[PDB]
Write a protein that binds this ligand. Structure first.
Ligand code: NA
Ligand code: NA
Ligand code: NA
Ligand code: NA
Ligand code: NA
Ligand SMILES: [Zn+2]
Length: 317
């Protein structure tokens, strides 16, 4: 007798494993719909005896599987799992060296922006609500980052090789972060329209666009008003474990002891390359696999991260 059937497990979350008896005369596709083995699309291939006992990813095709997928990924986007697997097939071949004491990514497939995201996240006090991200994030910190990168890509709506942006990616990822108690209060004054207090929560409490300087947000920054004037605003209260300050790329000085980490962007509107700046015993520039230690830094910066716990202004009235 030749082997005619094998047992395998199917899954949408790599936790709940569903036993299947596979007919070796049919493709995986004919039995399960689109099917993946460690990210590889095996929809069109027939089973091999060596597949016995292995785990295959499938698409959520009934209410139980849809619920498992929602519970794990925190999205109802039906294209998600397929995009995640498509990315994973490539990211499993990336290398994740330890550079400046952090897990970095050796350059491949225009992944510099992802390396900068990964490096930043390891330095923030952040956790993810979606179990897929939290579990992958833990593994990534130790150097097993292929799954985390594939997830970031899928959550971002980016494919492997696509040119990306750190701030855009962070906006997508932080939607799944533990920011429900993050709070920001801003005092806003327009000479025409008057005063108001703006309260922001979640992602909007930790991300700012317009200046790289947390000090400047504290002391006063210009912001457009609906009337056409420039109003001024300053930070009254902040409750979060970090803040991310972003601005269109420009030359900026970074001084050890005054920030957590940052993204350098060399380039312009068309094209650019993202590197990571951090500090340990001195300033570090981490460009994928490559470290440069620095005694000063003045260069093109787009995002600066700062530690926070709780801040309250001393500006009166
Ligand atoms: Na960074
Ligand atoms: Na995961
Ligand atoms: Na901010
Ligand atoms: Na302030
Ligand atoms: Na990097
Ligand atoms: Zn106004």
């Amino acid at each position: 007798m030749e082997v005619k059937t094998i047992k395998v497990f199917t899954t949408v979350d790599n936790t709940n494993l569903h036993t299947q008896l596979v007919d070796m005369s049919m493709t995986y596709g004919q039995q399960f719909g689109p099917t993946y083995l460690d990210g590889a699309d095996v929809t069109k291939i027939k089973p091999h005896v060596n597949h016995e006992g292995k785990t295959f990813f499938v698409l959520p095709s009934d209410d139980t599987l849809r619920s498992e997928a929602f519970e794990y990924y925190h999205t109802l986007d039906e294209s998600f799992l397929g995009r995640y697997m498509s990315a994973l097939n490539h990211t499993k071949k990336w290398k994740f060296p330890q550079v400046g004491g952090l897990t970095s990514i050796k350059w491949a497939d225009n992944n510099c922006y992802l390396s900068s995201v990964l490096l930043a996240l390891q330095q923030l006090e952040v956790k993810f609500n979606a179990p897929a991200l939290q579990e992958a994030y833990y593994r990534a910190r130790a150097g097993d980052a292929a799954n985390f990168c594939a997830l970031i890509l899928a959550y971002s709506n980016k494919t492997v090789g696509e040119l990306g942006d750190v701030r855009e990616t962070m906006t997508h990822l932080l939607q799944h972060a533990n920011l429900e108690s993050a709070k920001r209060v801003l005092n806003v004054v327009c000479k025409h329209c008057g005063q108001k207090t703006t309260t922001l929560t979640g992602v909007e409490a930790v991300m700012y666009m317009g200046t790289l300087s947390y000090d400047n947000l504290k002391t006063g920054v210009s912001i457009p008003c609906v009337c056409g004037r420039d109003a001024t605003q300053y930070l009254v209260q902040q409750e979060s474990s970090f803040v991310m300050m972003s601005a269109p790329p420009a030359e900026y000085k970074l001084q050890q002891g005054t920030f957590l980490c940052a993204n350098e962007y060399t380039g312009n509107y068309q094209c650019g390359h993202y590197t990571h700046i951090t500090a340990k015993e001195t300033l570090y520039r981490i460009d994928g696999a490559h470290l440069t230690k620095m005694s000063e830094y003045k260069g093109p910066v787009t995002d600066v991260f700062y530690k926070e716990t709780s801040y309250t202004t001393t500006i009166l009235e």
